[PDB]
Design an enzyme around this catalytic site. Structure first.
Site, PDB file in Angstrom:
ATOM      1  N   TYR A  22     -19.529  26.270  14.800  1.00 10.59           N
ATOM      2  CA  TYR A  22     -19.546  25.355  13.657  1.00 10.59           C
ATOM      3  C   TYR A  22     -19.577  23.898  14.117  1.00 10.59           C
ATOM      4  O   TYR A  22     -18.872  23.519  15.053  1.00 10.59           O
ATOM      5  CB  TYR A  22     -18.310  25.613  12.788  1.00 10.59           C
ATOM      6  CG  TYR A  22     -18.145  24.681  11.605  1.00 10.59           C
ATOM      7  CD1 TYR A  22     -18.915  24.837  10.458  1.00 10.59           C
ATOM      8  CD2 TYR A  22     -17.201  23.657  11.626  1.00 10.59           C
ATOM      9  CE1 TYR A  22     -18.761  23.993   9.371  1.00 10.59           C
ATOM     10  CE2 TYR A  22     -17.039  22.808  10.543  1.00 10.59           C
ATOM     11  CZ  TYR A  22     -17.822  22.979   9.417  1.00 10.59           C
ATOM     12  OH  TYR A  22     -17.665  22.138   8.339  1.00 10.59           O
ATOM     13  N   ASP A  47     -20.023  21.780  -0.673  1.00 12.93           N
ATOM     14  CA  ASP A  47     -20.497  21.473   0.680  1.00 12.93           C
ATOM     15  C   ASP A  47     -21.775  22.250   0.972  1.00 12.93           C
ATOM     16  O   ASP A  47     -22.045  23.279   0.349  1.00 12.93           O
ATOM     17  CB  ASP A  47     -19.438  21.832   1.732  1.00 12.93           C
ATOM     18  CG  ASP A  47     -18.297  20.827   1.795  1.00 12.93           C
ATOM     19  OD1 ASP A  47     -18.242  19.907   0.950  1.00 12.93           O
ATOM     20  OD2 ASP A  47     -17.446  20.961   2.704  1.00 12.93           O
TER      21      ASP A  47
HETATM   22 MN   LIG Z   1     -19.610  18.019   5.390  1.00 12.59          MN
END
Ligand SMILES: [Mn+2]
Ligand SMILES: [Mn+2]
Ligand SMILES: [Mn+2]
Ligand SMILES: [Mn+2]
Ligand SMILES: [Mn+2]
Ligand SMILES: [Mn+2]
Ligand SMILES: [Mn+2]
Ligand SMILES: [Mn+2]
Ligand SMILES: [Mn+2]
Ligand SMILES: [Mn+2]
Ligand SMILES: [Mn+2]
Ligand SMILES: [Mn+2]
Ligand SMILES: [Mn+2]
EC number: 3.6.1.1
Lengths: 160, 160, 160, 161, 160, 160
Positions: D44, D91
């Protein structure tokens, strides 16, 4: 050169103190070390041996990479570690992979660098410091001759 | 309630002693420890601080999982390790992650288990044993009140 | 003796081939190796050097425990591995920790055991096999004395 | 031949530590230790040289054979996109693969990525903040490369300022 | 006080779900978890016991450092996690190391922090979400008193 | 759909070459690899099989995450790696986890990525290059059918 099978119990860098039960063959967690220390070499015992202690001979094997608990390693002795703990005296044979040409330069205790001997020594002296009623008071290194001697005896003790 | 950024340079359970070169900001390898020991807690220093030695005040962060060298951690002090070594004195502020309700039970030094404290002391006493010219002769565990004083006292030295 | 800092790009035992970007200083992942093999020693480049190609002189550092990507190490040359890749020739200065008495016994190429050298050699020959267009034909070992020149060659052309 | 960009990995695969790169400093910070017994299902991070609606770089999920370290750069191309809705609103997380790596040529659009991994990735991002005090997840789903590239394209021209 | 041997089959921080074949006594990879989760404690079973399942009681041992699969751990109960899955009801004894002074403060389920208790619960509630025809509908904690009952019941069921 | 039990000896990414002692059942360290290579997939042998060379069928198992030595795995074949070391034919049956929906798209050798097959081949060919009097002169991939046939031959050999 002399040779024997070592059953490794505690891998190099472990703070968990594993033991093998000598009847069941099961691995067991004895305890987590109370000091901030980790076994400097792979630690175990020599299979099919027997000392004055009643237990088999304890052993220390220098390896390029550590192994798992219960793993077998064919090793040969280059020295022995004599020390006196709260249970009187116990011996620990320093070993090296047998039938390995990469370890031919190490033929006796004098070939094992003093830094690693001093470290191994340091570990066993201090690892029980923060355990009440436990200590290690005396410690010194002896050569391959007396190691092989003590192993030769302890193999015979096992036969009877 | 105090709060500051601790730069962790050595992770827990490590034998490679890393240093952050405060001039360049790079992570440097100082040395591989001569004793067979491992850092009990994540060890580093406090940001924007300065001390008598010209180096920032050292820090010990308690974490559920270790971090990498150079990683920042928002932390609050709950005690301090007072030790006296080769180069005079070196004090290490024991910390806890700030803004974490899982560590709210840890407020002062009395809240940290004695076993963790004994282990942390044991390390910083014994880790430089086998190194020549290096030593440790005094070691105490003081409370938060004094830790908060030594931080602030050191924070202002940076301001100057 | 000669001494310098080596930035470690790739830790020992890695199949991820990291490389430091030299215009920024960031740690770029070049590629996951196509071959089923890992880097035999901690690998990187000598700081403040420049070669015949615009990249700093590549370096290998013998270490007891591997470091992370981007870590600096005070190094000392004891040999050098020259190869010939698809982009012509390449140089790999074999080093040890400078100021560590545990590496005082290693003063030249001959002191390093030939099994570790053959291993290193074996890696750099084969790691690009399954990559297309890439290859390695020539690969031999020179000594400390000549390695020290190659550094100082790379140092002065860097100064310009 | 195709669209690609840098991706700075913040958190390696299999991690419970929630690392965060400070975009103003370049320092890696420990945000928190995840409050749930879960590990990040992929490497990530964020896409370097972009700017999202929230005034932060566009988040990225890079599929790799072996994980990297925090702060490591990885040239990558988008394959799909993960759009979720949490306590901050919505998001966007771009699903990626290594750029110029022929071992990932077989992954062109999101349909190529196997269902069990897409579910595994979604499942993480739905549940990972369950036990966390004042945080939650409402909705989450996937979209194709066409949309993925478009949001990056919006995010890159929005970076110029 | 009650005490028993736990056989840890799954270490803490693992996505590989191992299980021991209770007839052959060998370790077996059951399945890689379909969800992106990891066992929050060391997970195992109690030796010389038997539930209604025809299988021993599953055990949850809190440790300072995880162990390997198949390792024995002398442990004592401090509570029990009771759940209801697709197969029916399954109960798991929450334990700590027996005869270890560092866990003497942990006496009942109340002493274990709620954050860790919520975390352990969360695992078993969600780890079989993506598994088809597999679910849990109940998840509650109970004290040592009721925990000890189930541990004793099953010890008696063992004798046949 | 044919399936069987595989005992994994060496986890993916290991340089320690473990071996299960068939007459004993215990895990043994055969040798630390002389080449700087790591096993690209989990390596072991199929339970209750027997070949011309007195050992069971060697087997490769594609897993998302590696296991430990001695762990059992329900597995089904999709192909076979044919090779000829210094002791003639020594084939290896490529496998996947049996009854795992995440491996259903892998039914035959062609379904496996070619890049991963190249790496496995590459490993076995070269990993004994630095060991004297040892080699691998042959290497070929074959059908699931060919694999399944050879397995079933060796199940026939076993009953005696
Ligand atoms: Mn973000
Ligand atoms: Mn012993
Ligand atoms: Mn003894
Ligand atoms: Mn004592
Ligand atoms: Mn200081
Ligand atoms: Mn380089
Ligand atoms: Mn919540
Ligand atoms: Mn059960
Ligand atoms: Mn079970
Ligand atoms: Mn389900
Ligand atoms: Mn065979
Ligand atoms: Mn074999
Ligand atoms: Mn050969």
């Amino acid at each position: 050169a002399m040779q024997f099978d070592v059953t490794i119990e505690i891998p190099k860098g472990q703070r968990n103190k594993y033991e093998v039960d000598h009847e069941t063959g099961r691995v067991r967690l004895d305890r987590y070390l109370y000091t901030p220390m980790a076994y400097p070499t792979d630690y175990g015992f020599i299979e099919d041996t027997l000392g004055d202690d009643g237990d088999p001979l304890d052993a220390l094997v220098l390896l390029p990479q550590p192994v798992f608990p219960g793993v077998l390693v064919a090793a040969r002795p280059v020295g022995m570690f004599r020390m006196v703990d709260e249970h009187g005296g116990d011996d620990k044979v320093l070993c090296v992979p047998a039938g390995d040409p990469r370890w031919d330069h190490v033929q006796d205790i004098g070939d094992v660098p003093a830094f690693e001997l001093d470290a191994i020594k340091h570990f066993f002296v201090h690892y029980k410091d923060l355990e009440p009623g436990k200590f290690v008071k005396a410690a010194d290194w002896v050569d391959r001759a007396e190691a092989e001697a003590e192993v030769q005896r302890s193999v015979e003790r096992f036969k009877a």
